Each structure stands twice: as structure tokens, then as C-alpha cells.
Design a protein around this nucleic acid. Structure first.
Ligand SMILES: [Cl-]
Ligand SMILES: [Mg+2]
Ligand SMILES: [Mg+2]
Ligand SMILES: [Mg+2]
Ligand SMILES: [Mg+2]
Ligand SMILES: [Mg+2]
Lengths: 49, 836, 49
RNA sequence: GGCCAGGUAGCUCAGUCGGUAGAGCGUCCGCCUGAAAAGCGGAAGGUCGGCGGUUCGAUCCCGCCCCUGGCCACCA
């Protein structure tokens, strides 16, 4: 429950709206930073169709 | 030679935002967060500089080359202001006497940490250094020092002020749906949206009226089906070839990753950066006759203005004239019409090419030019003449000459006069519903007008016509995304959905866990095996040419050219992993994997595209699935070295074939099925230490010791054993036992039977069970004897028998009768002779 | 062959190359024959139960 | 797909620009030990990434290719 995440708008052909989730990665090589965890969004209406 | 993302300096962006919102100014840190918030990935924030102390403009007054060293070496006196000169040894070669350059003198500090003191070099003193753009943290040096254009500043002028070193460069990775953001125009507009600012579009009729149109300019023909949307042409006549771009223009091009060359080309790149419309300059005197847009012919070639020949394909769109190719349209101009040192008359080209055509062409030719990566993300066709006029006026300003009042403006066949995408109908509250947020009244109309759409409001439905630079806005969901990202995703609450009651793991899913658990508990370590077979593995195994394992699916473009075959068996990958571990010190090894294999058939081929505007029919669904190769789940294991380590209890036990049979039984117990093992011949196993595994009468795999020649030819350890089973051919099962525990005592007897040596011990035990009937509670082999009392090619087996009745105590004669019936059954089914 | 004078090496090397190849060729066939016997012995050896 | 550096023993790496190529650790034997290890002594193991060519003979020279690491670039 203490881990740091963040969600920000992004893009994927199959979602709209689309977003990317980063996690705060303390042991990243070269220094701690946000690192991409995965993609997400609302399923695109073309995918449903 | 070609860069990658969208770079631009903050000062430029601020300037364009400030026209509408006077005095808007934010920190780089806040600007970064705002850009991320609205959906632009900020890859880098580069503060220019910094520099300290005497870093000043200087003018090269004298050059003295220095021979005897590895390179040309110049001893230059530089005017540093107030009539003072410094001797400076410099390496570079892209300047003459008279050039304004930037000097870092003793006492200066360069980014980052480089303290400039007077140094010696090549037997001469140097009161500092002549800087490159890189050494100043201004841009990319292009292996040369920075020359400022004449009049940019006086010798002695403070370098940080002249170079604008308090600027900050943002590097953004723009998503491919936001082509309009590949410019200062779009990014400034996005910020005005995010900050609720009055916005002045830099690409409109704005501060000076458009140029006159008194007649046609150069003639143009466009071949049907090329996907060109607009093609405008306007000349600038009699420019000064000796003119150079002013420093403010060169700097902005440099900060945006573009090297400045000459005013005609610098202006096309500058306006491209500012407005998002790529522009090309042709030397007007080198065009022969009508300009034509056409497809390339098969096997045609073109020499781009970098002197490189390109093989063309028939989907590439060209600009040609009567004599040669002028350009690979939207990708790169040709040498034939390129602007050069002597050019005086320039024909400016503002065209809109098909995004897909440019994408195909540039990626195949590996030419991701500044123009190409803008056209493939689409370019606003409404601004072609606006950008053309901006370009022509700017070029006449820098280099002189006259802007001709002629214009060719081809807008399609028939001419298109409205570039807005179709209108979209959407309920007013739809963004609210998708977000799960009640936005303040009027938010959706406000936001969609901010991004430039026309919004009409009737009832509870909005009719929304996107602006011409937003061809990505096609359905309500597109509009929803605009509202949500500008409002900010942070306002969306976190609410777990109500899942209906699920059914949990499937039986197959549970069984895979159980098999995994059990094998790991038994000492096996899981590897996740590559699906790419080792080169010629089935030749090293010695497989028959028609062995089904050789019928492999092949990958066109594999990781390793020699490993394109997809695995039909997991053993090659496990055995490669075994060799890998043994090679690194761990000689006693047991590994398993649970993974799918790939087994093509006859019907394993392509299925043509099915339209995605409807559901595929059930027949198309089934044809798609039937066209894929079979992909069953397999489980496999390999072992070598000691199965049981040494210790205080003695020296430990080497792996043997029986360990592979036990792995089969571990898997079967985990799967809750019974298996039988039968002798088999099946490479790569040793034909005398190989079992085929059966569930019922269905074959599910093989187990045992590997063949010695396979071991030798694959560099495996002596005695390596192996198992591979097809999980998908092991049926699920749900046993529902109902034991009854007899309270009565049991009877123990043993029985010694002699059989031919080839009779499996289990077929004897089965015959004994068959004959003995219900009193038999247990049977267990405990002795196999082949000493001198036993004939040759025969063996004596002795089994411990336990008899027990459910309803009575037995006598020794009751068990003996059952034993004698078992003996007779064994003689009848396996030829057993009661031991005597 | 490296100690030989430069113009005496050509004729000496021919003999050396032919002699070594003659023995190498004889090894290859014997390796093969003994490998074939090993695999044929595997085929008739009595299996385990 | 661009650039840089490489490919040599079971592992990590030196080195040779035409006839001998190695080290450290890993493997094996003898002394030693009840059995070991160390120490001393002594072995085995490489088609020097592949295929051509030149040559009496190529790890080394010529051509073509494949792969490994790093740095760019690209993108679901
Ligand atoms: Cl007998
Ligand atoms: Mg992405
Ligand atoms: Mg969108
Ligand atoms: Mg008794
Ligand atoms: Mg190696
Ligand atoms: Mg010859």
C-alpha cells in the first residue's frame, strides 16, 4: 500500500481514452525514477464493433 | 544525420503563447508537469549552459596554420573587445579571418566543470579556447566550432546574453495521434488549453494580410490516386546568394536539432518548426518544364540531395519535371533541383502528401526526415498557403529579392474548399459518464471549443465538428479523451467494479499449478524455455527424416538466422539449459518446464483479412482457429549428475532412468490419473531404457535415459535422463472415492514367479491381481533375482501379498486359494512358473 | 617446417601434408566404425524393465 | 535498421598478421589421506564463429556471411 504510482494520458490504437501507468522504481540503473509499468484505457469502440 | 523527437526551446514556446496571454511565464518544472498531465511525454529538460566568467563574443583577426602535427592547427589572434587580442590555438576548420566566434578566456567555467586557464599546446600559449556549440551546452556541435553570422554581436559582448543561455530545451516524445503537436503552433495551443489562455494562432492572416494572388505560378499536374491533398507553389526572385540567416533564426534551428545551411533552406525548416507544415525550396532556374506528381515506375531510382541512389517502388510518390526527379514527395528532395550556393530564384513548395504513402516510403528507405515524420502523422491542409506566404516573406526579408504575386494552389480534383473532418454527435454528459466524474456545467463544450472544434448544442446532444488539424477526432470516444486529459486524470476517482461471481481457476489451470508445485518439491528447477530450436537439433538426435517433430513452423525473421524453427518438443530447450547450467559449475541438475509447443498440420496457413466493422462469423472464427498450428501444453524434465547429493549418510546416488520414470509418476499423481509405462524405441532416448507413457490406451509421452550418441553429439553429460508428456492429452479427472475400512485382520503371503526376462514386472503383478480377486488388498514387488538357479533369459520375481476380507477373519487356506488362483492367472497371461 | 629455409619448405610441406592427411583419414573411418558398433550394440543390449 | 568493439578450452580472458596458441579457475592421474582438499609432480580437452578463395599448408591474408556486448534509432 506504500508504493508510488502515477497515471498519465497516452495512446494505443485499441483504447480511447488511453493512459500509461508508471511506478517509482528506486533501484533503476542510474538513479531512481518513474518507470513504465503498463498501458490501459477504455476499450476502443472499433474493438467492440 | 537525422534526429528523433520534438525539441523546442521554452523561449520560443513562451513567445507564441504570450501573444494571446501577455506575460505568461512558468518554471520548467511546472511546464514539465503540465505537459505530462495533458498527455505529452517529456523525455528531457535541458537547461542551456551554464557558463561563468569571461565567455564572450570574439572576431578572428589573424589565422596562422601550424604544420608538423596530426591535424591542421590554427594559431589565431581574436579581438575580444576594447581593442584587445588573445592568441588562441584551435583545432577546428570551419571559419576564416573575420568570423564572429565565441571565446572562453582564462577565468571562465564551461558546462560542466571545465575551468579555462591559460594552457600551452604545440609550443604556443593559448589564452583560452574557441568553443563549439556542444562545449557550450547550446546544441550539437557537428564537429566544428560555432561561428555567429555577421552583425550578431560585437567582439566583447557577453556570450551568455548573445547565445540566450538562460533558455531551456524540452524534448518531447509526441504520440502518433497528435501530429499537430510536432510544432510550436500545436504545443502552444495545447498550453493555452491547459492554462485556459486566450490563444493567437500563429498560422492565420494575423498581423499582415496574405500575399497577393494576381496570376498562376509554376504549372503543375497531379496524377490521380497519389493521395496528394494540396500542392501550392510561390516563387521568390533575385535573392542574395551571399546572405546568411540572422543569429536568432540559426539559434532556434540549432536548439530544435536542425543544422542551418542557407536562408532558403533555413526558412523552410524554421516555418516547418513553427507552424507544423514542412516546406521545400527548389532552385527555380533548374526546373525544366511542368512540375508533375506521379507514382514511380518499377525499378526506378532517384538520387537524393545527399548523393545517394535510392531503389524506388511503385507506391512511392515523386515530384518530377520534364528531365529528372525533383523529389521523393514528402520525404527528401533530389539533387537535381536542390537549392545551392549560387541559387538566386527560389520556388517554394507547400504540399500535403498521403500520410500512409509517406510512412511506407520513409520506413522502407530508412529516411525518417523532419518532413516525413510530420506527413506520416498528418499535416493540417488548411495552412499550406499561409505557411507558404510566411516562408516567402521571411526569405525575402533575410536575403532580399522580390516576392512574386503569383501562386499555384492545387486543392484537389475537384477543388476542396473546406478541410474540416465530418461532424460528430455526442451526448453532453458522455465525458462525465466515461470519467465517472460530474464535471461543472459546460465543461465539455468549453474544452472541445478550446481544442478548436465548432460545437452546436441542441437538446442534450452536442454536434461537434473537429478542426482541420485534428483528423484523429472521429468518434465520441475521441472527444471524451480531449475533455478528460485537459481536466486532468487526477480528478477521476478510484472505484472497484462489481464483478459477478466468478468460477475461479479452471481444472487445467489448477492442475498446472499442482504439477509445478510437486516437481519443484521433488528437486526440479523450472526454466522458461525458448521456442526457437537449436540449429540442426533433430540431425544431432539422428531423427528419421519423416519424424513428425521435424514438421516445424518457421519464423521469417528470427533472433538467430540459424534458429528459425519453432519447437515441436520442449526437450531441445531444456537440454540446452541443462548444458548451460552444467557449464557454470552446477553439475548435479534437475530442470523442468511446463509450456506450449507448436505443431503445424496441413491446414496451417494464412486467412485473408476479415473486415473489422462487424463480428467475424462463427465460420470465420473457426477457420481462423483451424488455420493456426496446434499448440498443446507439454510438461518436460531433464536430469544429470547426482540425483541425491552426498552427505554424512554416504556418497549419494547418480541419476538413472528410474528417476525419469518417477518424474512421470510425480506428474501423474499431481494430475490424479493412472499411467502405465511400456518399453519403447523412440529417439533421443536409449532404446533399452525408454518408456512410452500411457493413460488408458492413449499415448501421452516418453521417459528414460537418453541415447549415448545423442549425448556425445550434443555435449550433454553422461547418463542424462529425460521426460516429456503432452498435458493436453492427459484427461481431466475428478475421482470420488468411497473407501470402506475392514476391521478384520489381514493375511500376509509372498509368491515367487519365474518369467521370461522380457516380461515387465507390472504385467506379472496385474496378472496376479486379476487371478486373486477381491481378497487381495495390496501387492508389492520386493525381489528380482537372476542368479544361477534361474535359467538364462529368465527372471524370478517375488511379490508381497496382503489379503483381507470385509466381513470376516480369513484362514491361511483362504489366502492360499486366492494365491493359487493368482498363480494360475499369471501362468495363463505371462507364462509364469511358480518358483521351485 | 618453420626451421627449414624458405625455398625448401614447399616440397617438405607437400610430404608433411600428405602424410598427416593419410593418418587423419584413417582415424576418421575408425572413429566412424567404432561409433557404428557402439550404436548397434545399444540396439541389441537387453533393456531395463 | 545506423555506429563502435568483439567471437580463441567447460567458465572468464590473453595472444599469434602463414608451419608451436596459452593463462587463471573447471576436468583426470600419481604421491599423500581411512576418504578428501591443499602442496609437489604430471596428463586430457580447442575444428582460434561459418563458408568459399589464395597457398605445398590459413585462427592469422582475400571475399561473403552469422552471432555476442555496448551505444543510437524505432514501437502495441
Ligand atoms: Cl528358470
Ligand atoms: Mg506508447
Ligand atoms: Mg484521442
Ligand atoms: Mg503365516
Ligand atoms: Mg567462450
Ligand atoms: Mg591448389
Amino acid at each position: 500500500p506504500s508504493a508510488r504510482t502515477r497515471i498519465r494520458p497516452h495512446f494505443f490504437p485499441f483504447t480511447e481514452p488511453s493512459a500509461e501507468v508508471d511506478v517509482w522504481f528506486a533501484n533503476k540503473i542510474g538513479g531512481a525514477a518513474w518507470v513504465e509499468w503498463g498501458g490501459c484505457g477504455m476499450v476502443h469502440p472499433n474493438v467492440l464493433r | 544525420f537525422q534526429s528523433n523527437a520534438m525539441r523546442l526551446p521554452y523561449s520560443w514556446l513562451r513567445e507564441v503563447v504570450a501573444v494571446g496571454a501577455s506575460g505568461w511565464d512558468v518554471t520548467p518544472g511546472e511546464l514539465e508537469q503540465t505537459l505530462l498531465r495533458i498527455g505529452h511525454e517529456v523525455e528531457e529538460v535541458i537547461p542551456l549552459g551554464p557558463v561563468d566568467g569571461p565567455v564572450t563574443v570574439g572576431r578572428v583577426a589573424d589565422i596562422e596554420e601550424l604544420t608538423g602535427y596530426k591535424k591542421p592547427i590554427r594559431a589565431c589572434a581574436v579581438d575580444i573587445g576594447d581593442r584587445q587580442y588573445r592568441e588562441i590555438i584551435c583545432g577546428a576548420t570551419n571559419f576564416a579571418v573575420g568570423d564572429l566566434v565565441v571565446v572562453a578566456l582564462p577565468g571562465a567555467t564551461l558546462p560542466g566543470g571545465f575551468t579555462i586557464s591559460a594552457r600551452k599546446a604545440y609550443g604556443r600559449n593559448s589564452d583560452g579556447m574557441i568553443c563549439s556549440a556542444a562545449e557550450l551546452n547550446l546544441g550539437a556541435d557537428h564537429s566544428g566550432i560555432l561561428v555567429l553570422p555577421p552583425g550578431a554581436a560585437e567582439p566583447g559582448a557577453d556570450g551568455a546574453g548573445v547565445l540566450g543561455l538562460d533558455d531551456v530545451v524540452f524534448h518531447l516524445a509526441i504520440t502518433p495521434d497528435r501530429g499537430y503537436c510536432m510544432s510550436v503552433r500545436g504545443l502552444a495551443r495545447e498550453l493555452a488549453c491547459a492554462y485556459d489562455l486566450d490563444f493567437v494562432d500563429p498560422a492565420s492572416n494575423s498581423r499582415v494580410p496574405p500575399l497577393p494572388i494576381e496570376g498562376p505560378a509554376w504549372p503543375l499536374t497531379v496524377q490521380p490516386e497519389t493521395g496528394v491533398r494540396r500542392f501550392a507553389l510561390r516563387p521568390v526572385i533575385g535573392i542574395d546568394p551571399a546572405a546568411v540567416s540572422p543569429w536568432w533564426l540559426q539559434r532556434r534551428l540549432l536548439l530544435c536539432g536542425i543544422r542551418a545551411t542557407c536562408p532558403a533552406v533555413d526558412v523552410t525548416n524554421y516555418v516547418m518548426l513553427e507552424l507544423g507544415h514542412p516546406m521545400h525550396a527548389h532552385d527555380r532556374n533548374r526546373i525544366s518544364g511542368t512540375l508533375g506528381v506521379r507514382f514511380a515506375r518499377s525499378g526506378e531510382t532517384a538520387v537524393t540531395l545527399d548523393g545517394i541512389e535510392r531503389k524506388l517502388d511503385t507506391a512511392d510518390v515523386l515530384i518530377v519535371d520534364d528531365a529528372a526527379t525533383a523529389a521523393i514527395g514528402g520525404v527528401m528532395g533530389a539533387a537535381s533541383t536542390e537549392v545551392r550556393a549560387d541559387s538566386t530564384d527560389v520556388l517554394l513548395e507547400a504540399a500535403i502528401w498521403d500520410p500512409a504513402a509517406v510512412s511506407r516510403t520513409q520506413r522502407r528507405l530508412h529516411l525518417p526526415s523532419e518532413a516525413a515524420r510530420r506527413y506520416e502523422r498528418t499535416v493540417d491542409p488548411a495552412i499550406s498557403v499561409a505557411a507558404l506566404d510566411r516562408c516567402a516573406r521571411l526569405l525575402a526579408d533575410i536575403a532580399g529579392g522580390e516576392v512574386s504575386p503569383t501562386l499555384t494552389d492545387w486543392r484537389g480534383d475537384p477543388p476542396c474548399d473546406d478541410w474540416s473532418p465530418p461532424p460528430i454527435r455526442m451526448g453532453v454528459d458522455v465525458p462525465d459518464r466515461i470519467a465517472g466524474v460530474a464535471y461543472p456545467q459546460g465543461t465539455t463544450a468549453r474544452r472541445l471549443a478550446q481544442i478548436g472544434a465548432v460545437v452546436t448544442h441542441d437538446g442534450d446532444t452536442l454536434t461537434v465538428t473537429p478542426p482541420s488539424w485534428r483528423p484523429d477526432l472521429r468518434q465520441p470516444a475521441d472527444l471524451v479523451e480531449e475533455v478528460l486529459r485537459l481536466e486532468g486524470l487526477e480528478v477521476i476517482p478510484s472505484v472497484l467494479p462489481p464483478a459477478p461471481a466468478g468460477r475461479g481457476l479452471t481444472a487445467g489451470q489448477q492442475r498446472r499449478r499442482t504439477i509445478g508445485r510437486s516437481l519443484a518439491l521433488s528437486g526440479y528447477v523450472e526454466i522458461l524455455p525458448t521456442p526457437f530450436l537449436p540449429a540442426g537439433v533433430f540431425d544431432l538426435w539422428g531423427l528419421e527424416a519423416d519424424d513428425s517433430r521435424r514438421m516445424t513452423t518457421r519464423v521469417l525473421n528470427p533472433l538467430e538466422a540459424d534458429r528459425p524453427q519453432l519447437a515441436t518438443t520442449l526437450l531441445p530447450a531444456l537440454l540446452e539449459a541443462l548444458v548451460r547450467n552444467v557449464s557454470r559449475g552446477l553439475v548435479d541438475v534437475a530442470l523442468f518446464a511446463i509450456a506450449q509447443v507448436v505443431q503445424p498440420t496441413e491446414q496451417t496457413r494464412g486467412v485473408g483479412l476479415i473486415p473489422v466493422d462487424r463480428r467475424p462469423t462463427d465460420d470465420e472464427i473457426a477457420m481462423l482457429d483451424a488455420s493456426l498450428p496446434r499448440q498443446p501444453q507439454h510438461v518436460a524434465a531433464v536430469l544429470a549428475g547426482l540425483r541425491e547429493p552426498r552427505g554424512p549418510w554416504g556418497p549419494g546416488r547418480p541419476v538413472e532412468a528410474a528417476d525419469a520414470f518417477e518424474a512421470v509418476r510425480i506428474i501423474a499423481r499431481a494430475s490424479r490419473v493412472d499411467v502405465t509405462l511400456r518399453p519403447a524405441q523412440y529417439l533421443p532416448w536409449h532404446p533399452g531404457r525408454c518408456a512410452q507413457v500411457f493413460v488408458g490406451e492413449s499415448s501421452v509421452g516418453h521417459a528414460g535415459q537418453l541415447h549415448p550418441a545423442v549425448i556425445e553429439r550434443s555435449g550433454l553429460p553422461k547418463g542424462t535422463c529425460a521426460v516429456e508428456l503432452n498435458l493436453d492429452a492427459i484427461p481431466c479427472s475428478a475421482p470420488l472415492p468411497a473407501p470402506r475400512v475392514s476391521p478384520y485382520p489381514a493375511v500376509f503371503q509372498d509368491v515367487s514367479l519365474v518369467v521370461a526376462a522380457d516380461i515387465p514386472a507390472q504385467a506379472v503383478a496385474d496378472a496376479v491381481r486379476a487371478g486373486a480377486g477381491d481378497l487381495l488388498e495390496d501387492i508389492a514387488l520386493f525381489d528380482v533375482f537372476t542368479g544361477p538357479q534361474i535359467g538364462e533369459h529368465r527372471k524370478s520375481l517375488t511379490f508381497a501379498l496382503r489379503f483381507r476380507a470385509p466381513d470376516r477373519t480369513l484362514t491361511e487356506d483362504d489366502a492360499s486359494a486366492a494365491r493359487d488362483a493368482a498363480v494360475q492367472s499369471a501362468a495363463e497371461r505371462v507364462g509364469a512358473v511358480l518358483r521351485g | 617446417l618453420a626451421v627449414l629455409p624458405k625455398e625448401q619448405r614447399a616440397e617438405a610441406g607437400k610430404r608433411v601434408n600428405a602424410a598427416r592427411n593419410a593418418a587423419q583419414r584413417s582415424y576418421d573411418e575408425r572413429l566412424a566404425t567404432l561409433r557404428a558398433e557402439r550404436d548397434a550394440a545399444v540396439l541389441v543390449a537387453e533393456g531395463i524393465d
